[PDB]
Design a protein around this ligand. Structure first.
Ligand SMILES: O=C(O)[C@H]1NCC[C@H]1O
Ligand code: FES
Length: 559
């Protein structure tokens, strides 16, 4: 029996337990504290005041901002209890303690005690004990850092570079300690993800850092934001939402971040190369950078991305170290005939469910030669159901030859698993009023593939077709004629926004059901939008747009 203090504090309340990880962004509504992940066992439960037992987190880096807002409003759970390593929620609780004077206790239990305490009705937490229904267990004090700090590190910690840089280093050093790191590491560039207006606290944190003089030290790009920056007012986004959403993006631009406003920064000319140590947030971008590009970055939670960008330093832990990039589980993936584009996001989705807390190696798929866009959609879906910052695909990704860990077990993803996943992501009617493409932001190749399927035809007037992409890709599609061909088919191409941050009336209010080819938005979409969401191929979506209807059936490779 072992209880370990991760973050100190005292709490008490009803046990809310689960064996499946939850992403607080997209899975918890900051307005109510209710679970909105329609595929999670806790869907509908309000977590406010409860003691949340779950093995670890999964999915989005933005959970840190959602949790912080929940702590600032009083709708957060009273405590968090894990049984494995965790970063996103712990970081959000650590920011709350460091900068907002709010303590949320976070405890990690051994797996046996986690299950035992999961069945309890009530839990109390104090700084020395955890008791579940009349059995008190001692809580070991937090791990204190065996951290090496350079002279420049200690100068930053001391305030030599101002208070903003100091607060940034304090958070980095606290994170390195809880990750058991023995040093920090230089990063060459950043990618900020907390620029999505996921909660009022996302703005509050950014304006606090910016008001202390925060500024980035390495070149740093920006993820998707919550307004079409140049057009949201003409678009009719309410001033109560669009004004803080625009000020959030403005705060990071003030701090020196490049206004790329895209969740596919690996498509930019500034994309990192193999072996390069970067510090990125946004789950799909982190996984793509490690998996496909071979660059190196942990899955940094929101807020921590800014601190890393401000100091040029990240904790030397996780996938920054070569040994931690070795496969930790083997997944034999069935290879049916007649694969189309929808295969790869489904495979990523199911791989995350099967491997939610370690780095898998997908075997059996190399000869299918997935495209860069296939791998992009795969990593995005994998970054929905798993916490891992990277994966490997045998015969496809550049590090797939690394020796698996001596402890790697072998599991499979069957055709039966795929048929189950397909129906799961297809809980909706056949009528649709919207086709949603571009989560993560569409590449130029994807915009060209979409145009090819449309084949010069125009969408049914009943079915809006919206593509979200980065500004640089839209500019490139404007120059090669792809953009005009899409507008000729009635397709609206939006910059800056993504499906994770879109809102009404840019998201058309008349929508009742939408179809998407994104495994990621298929999962998050129902709880984010309130609409029904269908998942399908690129051509499934286009046929939906041309006819007005998306037929409910398993695809060719599933027959
Ligand atoms: O890391 C993630 O997955 C989240 N960042 C912003 C939106 C969502 O993608
Ligand atoms: S912001 Fe979540 S994938 Fe675009």
């Amino acid at each position: 029996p072992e209880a370990r203090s991760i973050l100190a504090g005292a709490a008490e309340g009803k046990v809310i337990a689960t064996t499946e990880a939850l992403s607080f962004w997209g899975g918890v509504d900051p307005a109510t504290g209710k679970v909105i992940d329609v595929h999670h066992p806790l869907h509908g439960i309000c977590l406010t005041g409860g003691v949340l037992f779950m093995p670890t987190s999964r999915g989005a880096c933005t959970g840190s901002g959602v949790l912080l807002d929940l702590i600032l409003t009083g709708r957060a759970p009273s405590a968090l209890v894990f049984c494995e390593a965790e970063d996103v929620l712990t970081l959000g609780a650590l920011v709350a303690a460091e900068m907002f004077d709010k303590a949320l206790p976070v405890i990690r239990l051994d797996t046996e005690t986690f299950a035992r305490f999961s069945r309890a009705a009530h839990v109390r937490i104090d700084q020395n004990t955890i008791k579940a229904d009349g059995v008190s267990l001692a809580v070991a004090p937090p791990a204190t850092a065996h951290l090496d700090l350079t002279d420049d590190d200690r100068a930053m910690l001391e305030g030599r570079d101002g208070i903003a840089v100091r607060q940034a280093m304090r958070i980095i050093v606290a994170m390195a300690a809880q990750q058991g790191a023995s040093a920090l590491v230089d990063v060459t560039q950043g990618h900020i993800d907390g620029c999505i207006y996921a909660s009022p606290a996302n703005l509050t944190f950014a304006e606090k850092m910016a008001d202390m003089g925060g500024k980035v030290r390495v070149p740093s790009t920006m993820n998707a934001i919550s307004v079409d920056k140049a057009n949201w007012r003409a678009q009719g986004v309410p001033e109560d939402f669009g004004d803080p959403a625009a000020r959030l993006a403005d705060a990071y631009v003030r701090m020196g971040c490049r206004p790329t406003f895209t969740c596919s920064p690996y498509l930019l000319d500034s994309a990192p190369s193999a072996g390069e140590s970067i510090g990125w947030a946004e789950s799909n971008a982190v996984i793509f950078a490690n998996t496909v590009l071979g660059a190196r970055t942990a899955k940094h939670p929101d807020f921590l991305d800014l601190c890393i960008a401000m100091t040029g330093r990240a904790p030397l832990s996780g996938v920054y170290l070569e040994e931690n990039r070795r496969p930790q589980r083997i997944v034999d993936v069935a290879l049916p005939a007649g694969i189309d584009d929808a295969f790869w996001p489904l495979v990523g989705y199911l791989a995350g469910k099967a491997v939610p807390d370690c780095i898998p190696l997908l075997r059996g798929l190399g000869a299918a030669k997935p495209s860069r866009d296939d791998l992009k959609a795969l990593c995005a879906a994998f970054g929905t159901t798993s916490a891992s910052p990277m994966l490997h695909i045998e015969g496809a990704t550049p590090e797939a030859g690394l020796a698996p860990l001596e402890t790697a077990e072998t599991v499979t993803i069957s055709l039966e698993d795929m048929a189950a996943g397909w129906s799961l992501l297809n809980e909706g009617p056949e009528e649709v009023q919207l086709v949603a493409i571009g989560s993560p932001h569409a590449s130029l190749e994807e915009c060209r593939a979409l145009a090819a399927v449309f084949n010069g035809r125009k969408r049914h007037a009943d079915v809006a077709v919206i593509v979200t992409a980065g500004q640089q890709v839209i500019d490139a599609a404007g120059k090669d004629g792809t953009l005009q061909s899409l507008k000729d088919s009635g397709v609206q191409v939006l910059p800056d926004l993504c499906w994770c941050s879109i809102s009404e009336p840019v998201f058309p209010t008349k929508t009742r059901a939408l179809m998407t080819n994104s495994g990621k938005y298929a999962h998050y979409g129902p709880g984010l939008s309130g609409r029904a969401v269908r998942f399908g191929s690129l051509a499934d979506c286009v046929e939906s747009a041309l006819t007005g209807r998306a037929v409910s059936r398993l695809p060719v490779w599933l027959s």
